[PDB]
Amino acid sequence: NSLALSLTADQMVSALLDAEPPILYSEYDPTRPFSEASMMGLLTNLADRELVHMINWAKRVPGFVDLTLHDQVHLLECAWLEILMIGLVWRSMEHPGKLLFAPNLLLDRNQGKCVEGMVEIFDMLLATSSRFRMMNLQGEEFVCLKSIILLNSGVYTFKDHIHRVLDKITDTLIHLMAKAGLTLQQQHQRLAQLLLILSHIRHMSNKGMEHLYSMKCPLSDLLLEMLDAHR
Amino acid sequence: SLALSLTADQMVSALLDAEPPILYSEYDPTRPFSEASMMGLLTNLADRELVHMINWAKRVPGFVDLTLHDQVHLLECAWLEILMIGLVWRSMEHPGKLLFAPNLLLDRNQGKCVEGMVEIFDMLLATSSRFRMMNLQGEEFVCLKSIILLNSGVYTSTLKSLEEKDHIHRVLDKITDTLIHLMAKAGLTLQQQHQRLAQLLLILSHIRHMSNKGMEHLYSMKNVVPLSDLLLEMLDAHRL
Amino acid sequence: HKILHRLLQD
Amino acid sequence: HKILHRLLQD
Ligand SMILES: CC(=C(c1ccc(O)cc1)c1ccc(O)cc1)c1ccc(C(C)(C)C)cc1
Ligand SMILES: CC(=C(c1ccc(O)cc1)c1ccc(O)cc1)c1ccc(C(C)(C)C)cc1
Fold this sequence. Notes:
The complex is a heterotetramer, with two copies of chain A and two copies of chain C. Chain A is mostly helical. Chain A has a single domain (1-231), classed as Retinoid X Receptor (Orthogonal Bundle). Helices cover 64% and strands 3% of the residues of chain A. Chain A contains eight helices and two strands. In chain A, strand 1 and strand 2 (105-107) form a beta hairpin. In chain A, helix 1 crosses helix 5 and helix 3 runs antiparallel to helix 5. In chain A, 40% of the residues are buried. Chain C is mainly alpha-helical. The N and C termini of chain C lie far apart (15 Å). Bound molecules: 4,4'-[2-(4-tert-butylphenyl)prop-1-ene-1,1-diyl]diphenol (2 copies). One 4,4'-[2-(4-tert-butylphenyl)prop-1-ene-1,1-diyl]diphenol (5C7) binds next to helix 2, helix 3, helix 4 and helix 7 of chain B. One 4,4'-[2-(4-tert-butylphenyl)prop-1-ene-1,1-diyl]diphenol binds at residues 39, 42-43, 45-46, 49, 83-84, 86-87, 100, 114, 116-117, 120, 214, 217-218, 231 of chain B. It is classed as transcription.
């Protein structure tokens, strides 16, 4: 019982694709450049709005609905910045050297010098985006990786159902690579490469989180509660 | 390079042979426990393990091919991860216990005496429990530990040469091949092979998490408790 | 309690 | 210059 485990590989792909959250816009003020306040203002505002859509996306991730409410809360509180980051990184792929936070908010590493810790977090995000770009990450792979983050990042802090679903998503990934014409060796090599990048995404989240609840001295009440979960 | 010319069997034997020993702690069962002494025991242990780790890294295929600064960088990034997965591996057949040393076995209750320790302990216990349920093999463990060394620091020619990054990834691909070889050798089906491969690499994310959280608390008490010079420098690396 | 909850319910 | 550096160097 779950429905997710009964899905086929293509059913899994379409379901995840259809669940994809929209790309939101930042505020349309062309005033340049930014202060430390306005820069963090724009990003925080954006992140807070994205979170509302992330939570509806999560409910549509196969297997997530079968979890108890508190298990859903735990996984989201654990992985929210990871999920935002892999989204940002995916968005920025076609823009080498830049971070596409929103279609009207494309930033480079230089525009972050006005904030402590920003250049460092920017460079890592940029490195990740460049990595995805060199691997030619496909959208169908991206949605698999993102759902994996949701289910995996907090699973060790509770589980069998989640691992069964994680197994299903693995099957789906391999199915995608075989469909693309990759040899068997190429398939497991690519799987590994993709999953290992998730370790770095965790790192970026932890490092970013650490700064966030240090300078948390205006965050939305929701963002504060998500942030408070890591403290 | 030699790392790319090694078969899967040769990769395993090389990694197995390079395994560091299991060290003892200075644990005195007569001495009254204290927060400062418990952390002292763990710090002293880690500092001695670090020396073996550094010479272990040199024996990891492909690692010696890298420039010295890259070697330094990879170890500065991965040292706590490598210590932790080692601890977790030693603790597998000790349910609810962490085997820091043969004379230092600990449960989560003995961790409440320092702020932040019980949280790390629970995460480490959960990882060993995961390994125990998965029935992790030694040949798989040594592959995982060397993946961490080469992977954890690689995303941080040229202006910081990209040729090195490619060599590391080639070696990483070889270790992936080695993991798959082991799994097929164990009679697993293709579906089971890539599933177990995924399960293994996903645990590395949690190991990263434990290291990040552990590091965070570690450079907060740097609050009296004596760190060794090497440990102090490794810890400084996660700041600037 | 938490804003997350409500967002998850509806 | 760096303990790890020296140790890696021997
Ligand atoms: C890149 C990033 C964020 C962010 C998240 C929450 C905030 O309150 C502010 C920024 C982000 C990630 C993805 C996304 O779609 C939108 C926003 C971030 C940037 C800088 C930092 C500091 C280290 C400077 C605090 C932290 C997170
Ligand atoms: C589990 C762990 C450590 C450790 C590392 C460095 C130290 O100075 C002290 C302890 C460890 C890991 C593996 C190993 O083989 C030996 C030691 C650790 C325990 C507690 C903490 C705090 C959060 C309490 C700071 C950090 C790391």
